[PDB]
PDB file of N, CA, C and O in Angstrom:
ATOM      1  N   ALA A   1      15.253   1.806   1.908  1.00  0.00           N
ATOM      2  CA  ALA A   1      16.293   2.466   1.271  1.00  0.00           C
ATOM      3  C   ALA A   1      15.549   3.239  -0.159  1.00  0.00           C
ATOM      4  O   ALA A   1      14.643   3.044  -0.137  1.00  0.00           O
ATOM      5  N   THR A   2      16.421   4.082  -0.733  1.00  0.00           N
ATOM      6  CA  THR A   2      15.937   4.728  -1.899  1.00  0.00           C
ATOM      7  C   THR A   2      16.738   5.561  -2.571  1.00  0.00           C
ATOM      8  O   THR A   2      17.810   6.103  -1.864  1.00  0.00           O
ATOM      9  N   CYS A   3      16.960   5.580  -3.775  1.00  0.00           N
ATOM     10  CA  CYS A   3      17.839   6.286  -4.507  1.00  0.00           C
ATOM     11  C   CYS A   3      17.726   8.037  -4.346  1.00  0.00           C
ATOM     12  O   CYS A   3      16.708   8.268  -4.041  1.00  0.00           O
ATOM     13  N   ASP A   4      18.507   8.599  -5.219  1.00  0.00           N
ATOM     14  CA  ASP A   4      18.321   9.873  -5.113  1.00  0.00           C
ATOM     15  C   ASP A   4      18.231  10.712  -3.774  1.00  0.00           C
ATOM     16  O   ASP A   4      17.364  11.046  -3.346  1.00  0.00           O
ATOM     17  N   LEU A   5      19.275  10.341  -3.042  1.00  0.00           N
ATOM     18  CA  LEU A   5      19.203  10.963  -1.658  1.00  0.00           C
ATOM     19  C   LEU A   5      20.695  11.598  -1.016  1.00  0.00           C
ATOM     20  O   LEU A   5      20.783  12.904  -0.564  1.00  0.00           O
ATOM     21  N   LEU A   6      21.634  10.927  -1.459  1.00  0.00           N
ATOM     22  CA  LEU A   6      22.924  11.248  -1.218  1.00  0.00           C
ATOM     23  C   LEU A   6      23.383  12.794  -2.002  1.00  0.00           C
ATOM     24  O   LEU A   6      24.017  13.674  -1.441  1.00  0.00           O
ATOM     25  N   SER A   7      22.866  12.446  -3.293  1.00  0.00           N
ATOM     26  CA  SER A   7      23.353  13.335  -4.108  1.00  0.00           C
ATOM     27  C   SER A   7      22.673  13.265  -5.550  1.00  0.00           C
ATOM     28  O   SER A   7      22.376  12.400  -6.077  1.00  0.00           O
ATOM     29  N   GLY A   8      22.014  14.358  -6.105  1.00  0.00           N
ATOM     30  CA  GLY A   8      21.209  14.288  -7.322  1.00  0.00           C
ATOM     31  C   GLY A   8      22.223  14.333  -8.459  1.00  0.00           C
ATOM     32  O   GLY A   8      22.180  13.340  -9.232  1.00  0.00           O
ATOM     33  N   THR A   9      23.237  15.095  -8.483  1.00  0.00           N
ATOM     34  CA  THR A   9      24.221  14.966  -9.650  1.00  0.00           C
ATOM     35  C   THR A   9      25.132  13.717  -9.774  1.00  0.00           C
ATOM     36  O   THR A   9      26.020  13.577 -10.513  1.00  0.00           O
ATOM     37  N   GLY A  10      24.596  12.624  -8.742  1.00  0.00           N
ATOM     38  CA  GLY A  10      25.169  11.459  -9.005  1.00  0.00           C
ATOM     39  C   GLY A  10      24.231  10.400  -8.594  1.00  0.00           C
ATOM     40  O   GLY A  10      24.208   9.657  -7.504  1.00  0.00           O
ATOM     41  N   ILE A  11      23.312   9.772  -9.644  1.00  0.00           N
ATOM     42  CA  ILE A  11      22.646   8.642  -9.361  1.00  0.00           C
ATOM     43  C   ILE A  11      23.245   7.623  -8.605  1.00  0.00           C
ATOM     44  O   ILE A  11      24.285   7.234  -8.766  1.00  0.00           O
ATOM     45  N   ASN A  12      22.476   7.014  -7.885  1.00  0.00           N
ATOM     46  CA  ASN A  12      23.070   5.870  -7.083  1.00  0.00           C
ATOM     47  C   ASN A  12      22.692   4.469  -7.480  1.00  0.00           C
ATOM     48  O   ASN A  12      21.739   4.092  -7.698  1.00  0.00           O
ATOM     49  N   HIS A  13      23.809   4.057  -8.233  1.00  0.00           N
ATOM     50  CA  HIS A  13      23.521   2.504  -9.005  1.00  0.00           C
ATOM     51  C   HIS A  13      24.397   1.298  -7.979  1.00  0.00           C
ATOM     52  O   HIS A  13      23.733   0.782  -7.550  1.00  0.00           O
ATOM     53  N   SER A  14      25.636   1.473  -7.939  1.00  0.00           N
ATOM     54  CA  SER A  14      26.358   0.417  -7.133  1.00  0.00           C
ATOM     55  C   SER A  14      26.049   0.534  -5.632  1.00  0.00           C
ATOM     56  O   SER A  14      25.628  -0.300  -4.975  1.00  0.00           O
ATOM     57  N   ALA A  15      25.915   1.711  -5.191  1.00  0.00           N
ATOM     58  CA  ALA A  15      25.308   2.077  -3.661  1.00  0.00           C
ATOM     59  C   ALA A  15      24.364   0.856  -3.311  1.00  0.00           C
ATOM     60  O   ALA A  15      24.490   0.272  -2.377  1.00  0.00           O
ATOM     61  N   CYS A  16      23.344   0.622  -4.349  1.00  0.00           N
ATOM     62  CA  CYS A  16      22.569  -0.261  -3.974  1.00  0.00           C
ATOM     63  C   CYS A  16      23.068  -1.486  -3.576  1.00  0.00           C
ATOM     64  O   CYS A  16      22.903  -2.103  -2.630  1.00  0.00           O
ATOM     65  N   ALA A  17      23.305  -2.105  -4.748  1.00  0.00           N
ATOM     66  CA  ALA A  17      23.655  -3.587  -4.603  1.00  0.00           C
ATOM     67  C   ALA A  17      25.053  -3.697  -3.583  1.00  0.00           C
ATOM     68  O   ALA A  17      25.239  -4.788  -3.191  1.00  0.00           O
ATOM     69  N   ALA A  18      25.476  -2.617  -3.252  1.00  0.00           N
ATOM     70  CA  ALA A  18      26.712  -2.517  -2.061  1.00  0.00           C
ATOM     71  C   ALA A  18      26.240  -2.895  -0.979  1.00  0.00           C
ATOM     72  O   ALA A  18      26.357  -3.839  -0.170  1.00  0.00           O
ATOM     73  N   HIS A  19      25.123  -1.858  -0.380  1.00  0.00           N
ATOM     74  CA  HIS A  19      24.501  -2.086   1.079  1.00  0.00           C
ATOM     75  C   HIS A  19      23.779  -3.494   1.087  1.00  0.00           C
ATOM     76  O   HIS A  19      23.680  -3.844   1.932  1.00  0.00           O
ATOM     77  N   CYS A  20      23.020  -3.575  -0.165  1.00  0.00           N
ATOM     78  CA  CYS A  20      22.550  -4.945  -0.219  1.00  0.00           C
ATOM     79  C   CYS A  20      23.450  -6.320  -0.076  1.00  0.00           C
ATOM     80  O   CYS A  20      23.079  -7.027   0.928  1.00  0.00           O
ATOM     81  N   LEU A  21      24.443  -6.385  -0.784  1.00  0.00           N
ATOM     82  CA  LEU A  21      25.324  -7.399  -0.595  1.00  0.00           C
ATOM     83  C   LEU A  21      25.741  -7.764   1.068  1.00  0.00           C
ATOM     84  O   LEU A  21      25.430  -8.321   1.385  1.00  0.00           O
ATOM     85  N   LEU A  22      26.112  -6.505   1.484  1.00  0.00           N
ATOM     86  CA  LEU A  22      26.318  -6.202   3.146  1.00  0.00           C
ATOM     87  C   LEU A  22      25.376  -6.814   3.690  1.00  0.00           C
ATOM     88  O   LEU A  22      25.617  -7.548   4.897  1.00  0.00           O
ATOM     89  N   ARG A  23      24.181  -6.568   3.222  1.00  0.00           N
ATOM     90  CA  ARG A  23      22.814  -6.689   4.184  1.00  0.00           C
ATOM     91  C   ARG A  23      22.752  -8.225   3.930  1.00  0.00           C
ATOM     92  O   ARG A  23      21.929  -8.902   5.081  1.00  0.00           O
ATOM     93  N   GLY A  24      23.437  -8.973   3.185  1.00  0.00           N
ATOM     94  CA  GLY A  24      23.112 -10.185   3.353  1.00  0.00           C
ATOM     95  C   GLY A  24      22.232 -10.529   1.999  1.00  0.00           C
ATOM     96  O   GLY A  24      21.493 -11.416   2.059  1.00  0.00           O
ATOM     97  N   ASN A  25      22.530 -10.162   0.954  1.00  0.00           N
ATOM     98  CA  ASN A  25      21.773  -9.982  -0.235  1.00  0.00           C
ATOM     99  C   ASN A  25      22.520 -10.705  -1.416  1.00  0.00           C
ATOM    100  O   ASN A  25      23.641 -11.131  -1.440  1.00  0.00           O
ATOM    101  N   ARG A  26      21.877 -10.686  -2.569  1.00  0.00           N
ATOM    102  CA  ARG A  26      22.489 -10.977  -3.989  1.00  0.00           C
ATOM    103  C   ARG A  26      22.658 -10.206  -4.821  1.00  0.00           C
ATOM    104  O   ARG A  26      23.460 -10.133  -5.744  1.00  0.00           O
ATOM    105  N   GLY A  27      21.896  -9.018  -4.582  1.00  0.00           N
ATOM    106  CA  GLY A  27      21.843  -7.617  -5.188  1.00  0.00           C
ATOM    107  C   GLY A  27      20.749  -6.610  -5.129  1.00  0.00           C
ATOM    108  O   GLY A  27      19.880  -7.248  -4.505  1.00  0.00           O
ATOM    109  N   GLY A  28      20.789  -5.665  -5.892  1.00  0.00           N
ATOM    110  CA  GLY A  28      19.664  -4.647  -5.697  1.00  0.00           C
ATOM    111  C   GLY A  28      20.136  -3.563  -6.806  1.00  0.00           C
ATOM    112  O   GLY A  28      21.122  -3.189  -7.080  1.00  0.00           O
ATOM    113  N   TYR A  29      18.960  -2.753  -6.760  1.00  0.00           N
ATOM    114  CA  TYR A  29      19.162  -1.526  -7.659  1.00  0.00           C
ATOM    115  C   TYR A  29      18.038  -0.582  -7.936  1.00  0.00           C
ATOM    116  O   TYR A  29      16.974  -0.976  -7.146  1.00  0.00           O
ATOM    117  N   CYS A  30      18.163   0.658  -8.506  1.00  0.00           N
ATOM    118  CA  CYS A  30      17.278   1.690  -8.348  1.00  0.00           C
ATOM    119  C   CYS A  30      15.957   1.270  -9.182  1.00  0.00           C
ATOM    120  O   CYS A  30      16.245   1.872 -10.457  1.00  0.00           O
ATOM    121  N   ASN A  31      15.130   0.558  -9.109  1.00  0.00           N
ATOM    122  CA  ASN A  31      14.116   0.146 -10.063  1.00  0.00           C
ATOM    123  C   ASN A  31      12.954   1.008  -9.660  1.00  0.00           C
ATOM    124  O   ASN A  31      13.002   2.071  -9.092  1.00  0.00           O
ATOM    125  N   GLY A  32      11.723   0.586 -10.425  1.00  0.00           N
ATOM    126  CA  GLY A  32      10.633   1.437 -10.413  1.00  0.00           C
ATOM    127  C   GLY A  32      11.069   2.810 -10.921  1.00  0.00           C
ATOM    128  O   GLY A  32      10.522   3.480 -11.895  1.00  0.00           O
ATOM    129  N   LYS A  33      11.356   3.742 -10.202  1.00  0.00           N
ATOM    130  CA  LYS A  33      12.019   4.951 -10.532  1.00  0.00           C
ATOM    131  C   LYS A  33      12.674   5.728 -10.042  1.00  0.00           C
ATOM    132  O   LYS A  33      13.694   6.352 -10.341  1.00  0.00           O
ATOM    133  N   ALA A  34      12.711   5.212  -8.564  1.00  0.00           N
ATOM    134  CA  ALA A  34      13.390   5.959  -7.449  1.00  0.00           C
ATOM    135  C   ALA A  34      13.669   5.261  -6.070  1.00  0.00           C
ATOM    136  O   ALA A  34      13.495   5.675  -5.196  1.00  0.00           O
ATOM    137  N   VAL A  35      13.649   3.926  -6.467  1.00  0.00           N
ATOM    138  CA  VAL A  35      13.676   2.955  -5.366  1.00  0.00           C
ATOM    139  C   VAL A  35      14.590   1.743  -5.232  1.00  0.00           C
ATOM    140  O   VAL A  35      14.677   1.185  -6.056  1.00  0.00           O
ATOM    141  N   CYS A  36      15.460   1.881  -4.287  1.00  0.00           N
ATOM    142  CA  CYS A  36      16.532   0.746  -4.289  1.00  0.00           C
ATOM    143  C   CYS A  36      16.199  -0.458  -3.598  1.00  0.00           C
ATOM    144  O   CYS A  36      16.245  -0.621  -2.560  1.00  0.00           O
ATOM    145  N   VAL A  37      15.473  -1.271  -4.498  1.00  0.00           N
ATOM    146  CA  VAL A  37      15.002  -2.590  -4.114  1.00  0.00           C
ATOM    147  C   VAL A  37      16.317  -3.612  -3.854  1.00  0.00           C
ATOM    148  O   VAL A  37      17.216  -3.212  -4.243  1.00  0.00           O
ATOM    149  N   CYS A  38      15.892  -4.796  -3.340  1.00  0.00           N
ATOM    150  CA  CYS A  38      16.875  -5.647  -3.077  1.00  0.00           C
ATOM    151  C   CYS A  38      16.582  -6.928  -3.670  1.00  0.00           C
ATOM    152  O   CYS A  38      15.445  -7.031  -4.159  1.00  0.00           O
ATOM    153  N   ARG A  39      17.446  -7.938  -3.433  1.00  0.00           N
ATOM    154  CA  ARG A  39      17.102  -9.249  -4.098  1.00  0.00           C
ATOM    155  C   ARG A  39      18.189 -10.412  -3.630  1.00  0.00           C
ATOM    156  O   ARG A  39      19.440 -10.145  -3.716  1.00  0.00           O
ATOM    157  N   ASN A  40      17.661 -11.453  -3.196  1.00  0.00           N
ATOM    158  CA  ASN A  40      18.723 -12.652  -2.648  1.00  0.00           C
ATOM    159  C   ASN A  40      18.626 -13.579  -3.447  1.00  0.00           C
ATOM    160  O   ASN A  40      18.684 -14.726  -3.196  1.00  0.00           O
TER     161      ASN A  40
END
């Protein structure tokens, strides 16, 4: 996964923890600079 893809004028913040939660995670976010990491 990775941020800055669906739209530039709309940074992806929740989308991360969203697909993450459903993936069976505990959360996730655009860290580093433009990488949607996750975490259980």
